[PDB]
Symmetry: C5
Subunit: 384 residues, 5 copies
């Protein structure tokens, strides 16, 4: 006789119709069992709010036409037949915004009771809501909604292959060393409803992914810390040097270029910018405050050859915390030297005031950045 697989396949696929839903009684829906195993988080685009993942998805349903008695076919209990030869449910993801390029699986396993098993890998580009409020430490909760696109609850119902606890803790194949860490996938069944009669089976997997901040620690924190360090170094220049203000403005321009170039990576959304943006703005205010202090002190100590002398209150407050023709003609010589000396001494008194005030405002700025830095490391421990 002929081989068992040839006889079995010829018996099953003879006068078999792919278009008909395989039920002998049309009132019975084909319950399809869904299982999803996350393999990789290929991309998370916050600008377009799209998530590209790869999953291994296996489903099984009872085909009431692909049934046989194994004892009549040399005790064969299951066989593989082409996917395009049998009816396959139109179960797909609601959140699609594209089609994913994935290998086509040509065969499906069929058991002697009709239990067709369809294993396939598929790449999904799905629209998801991304909360970028705490960008470097954000936890994204994206829904993949498997449902029959056309058939209602009365034709195709969806159940879960494994128990929800098993699929929740499944990380057997996930590519872990990416930017995103898979926390869990959470299945939940519900019915979509257009009206009373048009109700659709639905299975939502809540893929939860946490961003790894070690990708971005160097990218954001290190340059800003450098800039603050150099700013703190810049106060050691004397206020009367004239280069100190140029130093400060050059540093501000550099950190502004840093902000501009970083903004191509730091994303944004309509709900609001990440708190990293707020801390960058606070760093900006700190640098602008340092520049304004430098400019004020430069205005204070300038050798402008016009200064009235320091007022008594200012002086005390600062220093508490620090032959007749020949005779008359020589008098003009000493008067001009005295006029220059008195003017020069006045400029020194302003310089003496401006030096210690530069020191005093350096300590306050030193403490202000110290309090700000300790506040940041405290909040980081909470996010960590």
């Amino acid at each position: 006789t002929q081989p068992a697989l040839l006889r079995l396949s010829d018996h099953l696929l003879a006068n078999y119709k792919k278009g008909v839903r395989p039920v002998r009684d049309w009132r019975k829906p084909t319950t399809v069992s869904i299982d999803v195993i996350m393999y990789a988080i290929l991309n998370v685009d916050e600008k377009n709010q799209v998530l590209t993942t790869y999953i291994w998805y296996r489903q099984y349903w009872t085909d009431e036409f692909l049934q046989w008695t194994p004892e009549d076919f040399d005790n064969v209990t299951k066989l593989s037949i082409p996917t395009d030869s049998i009816w396959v449910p139109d179960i797909l993801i609601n959140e699609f915004v594209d089609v994913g390029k994935s290998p086509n699986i040509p065969y499906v396993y069929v058991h002697h009771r009709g239990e067709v098993q369809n294993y396939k890998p598929l790449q999904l580009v799905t629209a998801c809501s991304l909360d970028i409020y705490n960008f470097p430490f954000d936890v994204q909760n994206c829904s993949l909604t498997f449902t029959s696109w056309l058939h209602t609850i009365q034709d195709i119902n969806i159940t879960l292959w494994r128990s929800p606890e098993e699929v929740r803790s499944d990380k057997s194949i996930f590519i872990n060393q990416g930017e995103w860490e898979l926390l869990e996938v959470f299945p939940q069944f519900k019915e979509f409803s257009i009206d009373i009669s048009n109700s659709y089976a639905e299975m939502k997997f809540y893929v939860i992914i946490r961003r790894r901040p070690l990708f971005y620690a160097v990218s954001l924190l290190l340059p800003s810390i450098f800039l603050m360090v150099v700013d703190i170094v810049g106060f050691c220049l004397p206020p009367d040097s004239g280069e100190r203000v140029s130093f400060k403005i050059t540093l501000l321009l550099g950190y502004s270029v840093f902000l501009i170039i970083v903004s191509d990576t730091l994303p944004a959304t309509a709900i609001g910018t990440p708190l990293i943006g707020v801390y960058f703005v606070v760093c900006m205010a700190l640098l602008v405050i340092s520049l304004a202090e430098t400019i004020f002190i430069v205005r204070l100590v300038h050798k402008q050859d016009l200064q009235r002398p320091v007022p008594d209150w200012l002086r005390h407050l600062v220093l508490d915390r620090a032959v007749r023709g020949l005779l008359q003609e020589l008098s003009s010589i000493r008067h001009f030297l005295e006029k220059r000396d008195e003017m020069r001494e006045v400029a020194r008194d302003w310089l003496r005031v401006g030096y210690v005030l530069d020191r005093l405002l350096f300590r306050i700025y030193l403490l202000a950045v110290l309090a700000y830095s300790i506040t940041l490391v405290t909040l980081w421990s909470i996010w960590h």
Copy 2:
């Protein structure tokens, strides 16, 4: 007997022709009812003027060959049959400039009266007219024109599934947290005409989308405001410092780099640049005016050792608003000191004039930027 679905499908699809338009009388057009549900605004490219969206589109038409009496087939009233087994109208969008990658839906529902229901998701890349005059606050009105590509009004006519008010206010599935907010989609029926006989059914959906400015507020307004703040800070430097002009030119270079880098995002069109461009140009004029004032005041107060003394009109106008050999040889000594002192005093008089004029032109510039800023916040309230 055989199962109802097998018998029904075999009866319907036997000697069924896909190429023929399913009408028993060829004079009757197949009225196709169109429904469009916007799911996401994937992209709006102003440079190329193309809009990429995703829609859920459902249509239904009466197939006069897919009719049966349910009482003869075990009371089955509707069944799903493959899309590629039956005639499907060639209804597509006129504004296509590409093909969208969308899932292929294999099945369609058919009721016992022949009412075929085709549900499918599709991504559309369509040419649209984008008015970028008020870029951060623009409201775009893009037309999606569903029509039968080949069949005229005498073969395929297009109606609307739901009432126009229902489709106008449909936001049940729209992904809202993107850059674009869907205001409404507006359906309108009209007939395209090549001649008297060649008239085509047409249904234009006017997708109206408003850009969310919170994406761009930080991107444009914040750096410019920073630059103006630093410019205002720069006036506190003394005019005779010599660094003030370097400060101003460095700031101008920084803001020019800001303009250059921002222009990769701020789009343009043949109709005209956005008013944001005009306000950036006005900010540019303000910075150039501040730089010119700095350069003029520096030219005024310079210690050039060549100045003639301040004219009487200028002085008043500004200050209203603020042994014989031994004897003759010593006279040369006091004369040279007097010559230096008189020259030094003249330089001081120019400095006294230039100081208050720097203050006076600082107040005017302070008020000019204040009036400009209040004007901007007033117009923003209207756009908001």
Copy 3:
């Protein structure tokens, strides 16, 4: 009896062969009439010299096998049959460098005389010659060559559906608000020839597109004008300030960064760079000339404490256009003051010369940029 469309389609498509060219006499070529309607200029890549457009293309040919008498089929005069069921000529564009993603049109109209009408939209990526000599105002003349890829003049000949004047002035559907304005499309028929026998039908449409310069006016002209304005402002700084040369070099660095960033947009070709490049180089020469004048004047007026006094010719040319021990020991005091005063006066004389020469060379540079600017606006009026 059966419906007319079913009977007609069954009669036509029974024993119909798609592979055969539909002529009862094989000597008669199938004359295909071509019509092209430009819809959008999607992209013009000057770097790769490729033009991506979208067209609505309709063709019609006489199929001698799809003929019937309408009075025998309930007076049906035309019917739509699937495109993949009948012979379709292999007419495509010679200039292809890719395949365009375009919707597939499933049906074609067939009249009772056999006149098959095939309407289809198609995106074309075609190699074209782009003359970038006058880049902002260039008029590109790109050829789309529709021809039968395989069949010679003896099998497929190509004619034009409409008169050439009608297709020349066709702008009914063109998307006008893009960067490119369609001037006309010009059809011309010719025969390609490999040898005497192997001659091919050919129809060249000369798509002529003019770039809209309002896209680029802001992008190129405005920043350069700004830079020149600031350069003109920079001369007001005194030559002895020392900051003027730093101002000029900073401005030159800024405009060089402008040139670098702009070059990512301004294209180039082997024939030659656009004249915009030449005018940018002339602006570069103007800025370098201003910098060299600043450096020369700074070298002239420096307080170098070493200057020999101004020569008589230079002075006139410039100013035409502007007790014994006690006695001897006091003499040394007045001599040292005289030595310093004479040296100081010499430095003033050089400064007096350098000041007016700075003014004189400022007027010449002011006129040179004025002549250059008026020359540019004159040539712009010709291009406009």
Copy 4:
């Protein structure tokens, strides 16, 4: 009689079923022999951790239905038949994250014993773990896992065509002049297991690729070396020039721009940044230390007209290693000159201290960068 190939193909492919696994006894698995020949490493994306390669992959299995006696068919021993006409195992790579665009091979060779030979080229985009710890010199070890997607060990088993030593040392077609050098590919057989019964054949090829550092030597090392050279040159400027600190800050800004622009190429991962990042940070610390030394020395030698004189310990430590009205009125003149001279001499003493300390701290910094450079060249020899 008919030609041998026609008769043989007609005999083989008559009543041949593609869906059945070609075994006369269904208990016998189809052992498929796998061979992989690497052709090119198209891309290694460290950001997404994906490897795109091209391979020539040949497989062979025994088809028990495609068997014939050559003496009955004119001594034909093998023939090519279309790939889509016979059963082909569903062997693919587990690590897929996309589908590769590769030519479709239409034919396969079949020998008279049934040995089908399938040669095909395929592009693979596979997820791989990339260790970027020593980025310029890293050796990546990426797994390509060929397995039957559906069939278990009981239906399809996988062996190796050639001996493992032959495939390990195979570089016959590899494109060598790319960025990556193929060290070896290592085959290893194992069984995947879902449970006791569901075990799958598996063949892992460990493609080992070493990056060529000559691509990146110029990109990273050369600019940093330049920056250090210029920094070393900058110490030759006198500390009192005032421009030295501006020189240092400008150099620091330039090298920071270098770091920013380079970071678009230097990748990162969650495990940790490459040691090149650590050496760049050490270079950053060196530049900041040089800037701080410059600022400290500038603070030390400033002509601030306020300095108390150098303390005795500091001085020694540094220098070890380097008519009554007329009479009284003239006394004021010499006193004022003495007051200025003593103040001027004090400023000189501070300058004398700061000069040699600048030299002394220049030698230490010269030795520190020398030790750092020699340390780098030593470690480079180990990596080389």
Copy 5:
């Protein structure tokens, strides 16, 4: 009777098998004649070492089953039949690293002797070895290897349609105005061999393409020449100005930014960087040498108020090539003036030395850049 084309096609394609290689005797290989006509060089990616071209490729082979006597079919000598209806050899390019998007040609010409003619355009992405040693003037020699992927020499042999001299000089359709100029394509036949029996036909076309340097002359040479010009201008600033060193460092930073931005275009390879990189490094050394000369001269002439006087050897070498209380108290006044004057004169002597040495080192640098520029223009003439 029926039309000739219908009868002929029905006679030929009845019981015609596509899978069989069309030979009546299986020992006779099907000699396929190859012809390749280059149409465009779409892209040359030196980073990935891939060449994307477009070719018109025509092949012809003798099909021994598609033969007829024309006198029996109304004297028809050739006819077009669908490509997918007849056997087509699996000839493709070995160097594929992708699949090219090209139009599908549906028909092929068949003559009455069986000579099938297959014309088709195809885009090829092929791995090629790119020698970037002389990047702007490089001549690339890339191999396209047409061979039968599966069939050996015993089944499919490959010959050339035209004589090798005709295909060598073929430029009839090449798009010439691109970046690459096609010098020639060179065909050569060889046999690949796996073993003694498994030998494969092979035809290598050596596409030779020369880069047009006019694309890049402006891109590289012009900015560097500008930078050198400005550097030469910078020497005219006096050494004691203090701004000269700032000028030089700003220029160096600008040219470094130029190098950084240019490196995104100038490619690299493992064999070695292009000589343009070496000349850029030499320009870098020239700028660093100019900066070091400026810093040295600034160190030489500084008004540091500490200089010992110029040594006798240095001076000559440089200048060869250029009442008791009242009496004693007045003596202190002249002594202090003498002390200041002698110190001031010493600073002048150092300035006199440093001025001419700046001139002398300017001439040497002027000649060094002149020799370097003449050397470059000489080598350019050889490359040109």
